[PDB]
């Protein structure tokens, strides 16, 4: 999955990082890796994964890390909300309730 | 997946922890993360995952941890059984046989 | 999945290594392990996985590793491109853009 490098950076995603993609439109859930893109606002699903989505679909991109007890206690997740143009609306360091 | 914080605590689930959800009604199996809820007895599936379940479905929520040999020998799993209202019926520290 | 040992070596795949197979023809995505093959250009899907592919299908074979921050900064992925006969066309140490 090619993600606008600036958007990826804000979400602390590194190139090659495995991420889980869940499609809100069709319910598909799959894993792939991040490719940093040079096109502003671009999110392009490549390869076999292209069959799991349709252009225009709304998706949630999740990145997980293996952490120990101390890391969990000090951890602050980076949650980025974007608009229809993939422009940043919000970036929080805590889950919503 | 939003889980009643008190129920989550009893199962030693931390907010943000990846868990596997398996639906007994429809057989769907998927992975998502825990969101601590403030509503008593509430278990709400959010986002794309909502398409994998129906309200009223019976599910099994599994949490795994990466352990070494010594940790495995000393490990005691926290198994929580609940009723139809998600009220605690039992909590054991060993598998059933 | 049995992979020509020479091809596997070029992609730094060790026997027994878990890999993710994604089929471009049918969109199937599954995980299995590597078996080193002695037949030149051979890629044979064995067991239950055989039902997820058809002979002749184009697939992408992915290998992931768990890395820390320092390892990520120094990491160079081994990306191998092959032709229709599974002969090596290219081997790069960086992602395409």
């Amino acid at each position: 999955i090619t993600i606008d490098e600036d958007l990826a950076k804000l979400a602390k995603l590194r190139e090659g990082m495995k991420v889980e993609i869940v499609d809100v439109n069709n319910g598909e859930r799959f894993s792939t890796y991040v490719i940093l893109g040079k096109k502003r606002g671009e999110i392009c699903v490549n390869g076999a994964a292209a069959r799991k989505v349709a252009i225009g679909d709304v998706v949630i991109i999740l990145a997980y890390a293996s952490m120990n007890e101390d890391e969990i206690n000090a951890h602050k997740p980076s949650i980025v909300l974007v608009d229809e143009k993939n422009e940043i609306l919000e970036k929080g360091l805590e889950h919503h309730h | 997946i939003t889980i009643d914080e008190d129920l989550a605590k009893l199962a030693k689930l931390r907010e943000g922890m990846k868990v596997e959800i398996v639906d007994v009604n429809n057989g769907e199996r998927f992975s998502t993360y825990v969101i601590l809820g403030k509503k008593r007895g509430e278990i709400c599936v959010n986002g794309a995952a909502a398409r994998k379940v129906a309200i009223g479905d019976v599910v099994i929520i599994l949490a795994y941890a990466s352990m070494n040999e010594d940790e495995i020998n000393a490990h005691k799993p926290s198994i929580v059984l609940v009723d139809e209202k998600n009220e605690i019926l039992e909590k054991g520290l060993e598998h059933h046989h | 999945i049995t992979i020509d040992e020479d091809l596997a070596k070029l992609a730094k795949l060790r026997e027994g290594m878990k890999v993710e197979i994604v089929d471009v023809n049918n969109g199937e995505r599954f995980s299995t392990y590597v078996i080193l093959g002695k037949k030149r250009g051979e890629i044979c899907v064995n067991g239950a996985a055989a039902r997820k592919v058809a002979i002749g299908d184009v697939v992408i074979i992915l290998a992931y590793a768990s890395m820390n921050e320092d390892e990520i900064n120094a990491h160079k992925p081994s990306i191998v491109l092959v032709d229709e006969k599974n002969e090596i066309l290219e081997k790069g140490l960086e992602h395409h853009h």
Binding site: K12, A63, M67, I72, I79 | - | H96
Partner: peptide, 24 residues
């Protein structure tokens, strides 16, 4: 002992393109 934890996420982004035969 370690656990997989949500590190970061991009919520409700829009797929702008798809390339089945993407090369490299």
């Amino acid at each position: 002992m370690t656990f997989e934890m949500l590190y970061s996420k991009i919520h409700r982004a829009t797929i702008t393109d798809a390339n089945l035969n993407y090369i490299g």
